[PDB]
């Protein structure tokens, strides 16, 4: 790993913290879409994309890769990752604070695993997916590409979620899909005074 | 930090554990409202208030402060706190086991952050609030003073909760307030045999 | 503790990881019901039962015990356990990644505490119960024997759950029982396109 890091990017601050938690001494913030074609003249420190938004993550990932930078994973030192889990190497993957990834799970490329999320044994988490704060996937769950799992959501064991799907905050997925969809919980209801 | 600690106070036991996890060698239990005016004759070891109940916490906090004691924070050594987060110094704040507080969050004075709760980047948590076990605040959430977030509850990003509000166990807050209120989830329903 | 471990048993892989996280150097997988009466001829390394299923756990536990093996607890080194908590010694108890067990809680014999679950102060968790991923018991909760708490479920403080009960994924228990029962949450609802 390099000693400084370029961070492209609120989610930028959190990525700075994870980078500094790993050995990084200096974070360099860039947030310039159009200046990106010139950035190839810069010293090749490690890069990270602190977006988003799957899908700007993905676009900018591709532009930065094609400009000769290495886009590393940021994994905080708190995360517990089984030696048999597969985390795509140098793939712009963010692994928060207190994440757990258990035996033979697979995390692909530019996934976000947000703080205290749990990926159980034998999960796949597809490319450019966002598993948010405290979201939990039970054993053998298959999350497709460009999915969003909202805060405190969960997925029961052995289930698949199709590409481009949204699981709302506090929702529990109970059924296999193959078709993309959106997947809401209950709403705290104000009690009337 | 002092070597012994006075603990005013079930929540008392848990506070004893956190104090001992930090370097404290001896915990001294007091639970005497009326004897408190005499306690000023005692050796000034660090103090902690292991109530409650916001609001007895607050009252007793004020009486103990005015009697010449320092009321410290108890932060277990498991908690992960961003160097840019603000935790009010010496302010009777309890931070449990596996709590995470991310970049630029603010925790004020006599807050309880119970075990495995998560305070995301740029939260405020107002004075004498109780964020209970496994409760999670997404980025930029504003919790008012004397609020209660029930077990396994969550608040979606960018939302504010007004002073004196209650979020029930397992509930998800989805909407801005400014008015105080109470904010219930669903009830596991016994299936009939 | 012995240097190798027999593991009887997906949940087997996860148990291998916990054993290796503790000092174990080699895991030996057995999954032979009928060959078990001969296994008494083997070297008496530590044993663990990586089932299940309460209740095969229990049956096989009893057969392996009667064959002269010690069935140890597997506790990952991440788990935080109050010095005043009681974890039944050498009792086939699995304690995952990021579990917290607070002051004066009791964990009996062949319980599963799955990853990031939380057992608050003064809980009992009865024999051969399964507290699953991210499930949380508030203070003074009594879980009976052979109970199942589903993923991301919770139990409010001071409540009892009777023997042989099931709490569904994402459900919140709000009421005392004494009678066994089953105890469902809400279902993420696909929104229609």
DSSP characters over B109-133: TT-EE-TT-EE-TT-EE-TT-EE-T
The β-bridge partners of B112 are B94, B130
C76 has binding-site annotation: no
* Sign of the alpha-carbon dihedral angle for A80, A86, A90, A95: negative
- Return the structure tokens found at A121: 């044994």
The residue written with tokens 């024999």 in the block is: C127
* Closest of B115, B156, A136 to residue C169, by C-alpha: A136
All structural domains of chain C: 1-72 (3.40.50.20), 73-184 (2.160.10.10)
* Closest of A148, A154, A121 to residue A135, by C-alpha: A154
* Closest of B21, B20, B51 to residue B36, by C-alpha: B51
d(CA A8, CA A28): 8
Q: Determine which helix (DSSP H) or strand (DSSP E) holds B45, and give its type and residue range.
A: none
Closest-CA residue of B relative to C186 is: B186
C92 has binding-site annotation: no
**CB within 8 A of B96, min separation 6: which ones?**
B14, B18, B76, B79, B113, B114, B115, B116, B117, B133, C100
Count the residues in chain B: 193
Yes or no: say if C119 and C139 are a contact pair by the CB < 8 Å rule. no
**CB within 8 A of B34, min separation 6: which ones?**
none
Q: Is A115 exposed, middle or buried (0-12, 13-18, 19+ CB in 10 A)?
A: buried
d(CA C28, CA A18): 37
- How do B189-191 and C182-184 pair as beta strands? antiparallel
Q: Determine which helix (DSSP H) or strand (DSSP E) holds C92, and give its type and residue range.
A: none
* Distance from chain centroid for Cα B146: 10
Enumerate long-range contacts of B174-177, CB under 8 Å, 24 or more apart: B174/A169, B174/A187, B174/A188, B177/A190
Q: Choose from A84, A139, A183 for mutation: most chain C CBs within 10 A.
A: A139
* Closest of C146, C118, C151 to residue C132, by C-alpha: C151
The residue written with tokens 């536990």 in the block is: C61
Phi-psi region of B13 (alpha: psi -120 to 50; beta: other; left: phi over 0): alpha
CA angle at B95 for the pair C150 and C140, rounded to the nearest 5°: 45
Phi–psi pair at B57, nearest 5 degrees: -50, -50
Count the residues in chain C: 193
**CB within 8 A of C38, min separation 6: which ones?**
none
Phi–psi pair at C63, nearest 5 degrees: -65, -45
d(CA A110, CA A88): 9
Q: Closest approach of chain B CAs to the CA of C78, in angstroms?
A: 10
Phi–psi pair at A113, nearest 5 degrees: -100, 100
Yes or no: say if B61 and B79 are a contact pair by the CB < 8 Å rule. no
Q: Is C164 exposed, middle or buried (0-12, 13-18, 19+ CB in 10 A)?
A: middle
The residue written with tokens 């504010």 in the block is: B160
Strand order across the beta sheet in which A124-125 lies: A86-87, A106-107, A124-125, A142-143, A160-161
Tell me the Cα Rg of chain C: 17
State in Å, rounded, how far the first CA of chain C is from the last one. 57
Cβ contact C98–A102 (<8 Å): no
**CB within 8 A of C34, min separation 6: which ones?**
none
* Sign of the alpha-carbon dihedral angle for C86, C89, C94, C96: positive
The β-bridge partners of C101 are C81, C119
CA diameter of chain B: 63
* Closest of A151, A149, A132 to residue A141, by C-alpha: A149
Yes or no: say if C128 and C147 are a contact pair by the CB < 8 Å rule. no
Task: Please provide the DSSP assignment of A75-135 as one string.
Answer: E-TT-EE-TT-EE-TTS--EE-TT-EE-TT-EE-TT-EE-TT-EE-TT-EE-TT-EE-TT-
Chain A residues whose C-beta is within 8 A of a chain C C-beta are: 80, 82-84, 98, 100, 102-104, 116, 118, 120-122, 134, 136, 138-140, 152-154, 156-157, 167-168, 170-174, 177, 181-186
- Residue B105 DSSP symbol: -
Q: For residue B116, how many C-alpha atoms fall within 13 Å in the half-sphere facing its CB?
A: 34
Instruction: Specify the 3-state DSSP secondary structure of C186.
Output: coil
d(CA C193, CA C115): 35
Residue C172 is nearest to which of B16, B115, B187, comparing CB atoms? B187
d(CA C63, CA B117): 41
Phi–psi pair at C12, nearest 5 degrees: -60, -40
Yes or no: say if B133 and B116 are a contact pair by the CB < 8 Å rule. yes
Yes or no: say if A187 and B189 are a contact pair by the CB < 8 Å rule. no
- Residue A37 DSSP symbol: G
- Return the structure tokens found at A190: 């104000």
What Å distances lie between residue B59 and B128, B165, C54, C130, CA to CA?
11, 19, 48, 41
The residue written with tokens 């481009």 in the block is: A164
Phi–psi pair at B53, nearest 5 degrees: 35, 110
d(CA B156, CA C24): 42
d(CA A71, CA A5): 10
Burial string for C125-143 (b: 16+ CB within 10 Å, else e) reads bbbbbbbbbbbbbbbbbbb
């Amino acid at each position: 790993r390099t000693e400084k890091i370029y961070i492209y990017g609120g989610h930028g601050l959190v990525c700075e913290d994870v980078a500094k938690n790993m050995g990084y001494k200096e974070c360099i913030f860039l947030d310039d879409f159009k200046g990106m074609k010139f950035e190839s003249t810069l010293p090749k420190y490690d890069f990270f994309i602190a977006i988003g938004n799957n899908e700007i993550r993905k676009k900018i990932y591709q532009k930065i890769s094609e400009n000769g930078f290495k886009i590393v994973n940021l994994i905080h030192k708190s995360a517990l990752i089984s030696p048999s889990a597969i985390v795509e190497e140098n793939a712009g993957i963010l692994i928060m604070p207190y994440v757990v990834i258990n035996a033979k799970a697979k995390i692909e490329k530019g996934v976000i695993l947000n703080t205290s999320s749990v990926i159980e044994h034998e999960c796949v988490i597809g490319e450019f997916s966002h598993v948010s704060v405290g979201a939990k996937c039970a054993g053998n769950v298959k999350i497709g590409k460009n999915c969003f799992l909202g805060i405190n959501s969960c997925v029961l064991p052995n289930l698949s979620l199709a590409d481009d799907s949204i699981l709302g905050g506090g929702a529990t997925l109970v059924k296999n899909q193959d078709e993309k969809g959106v997947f809401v919980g209950v709403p705290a209801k104000r009690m009337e005074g």
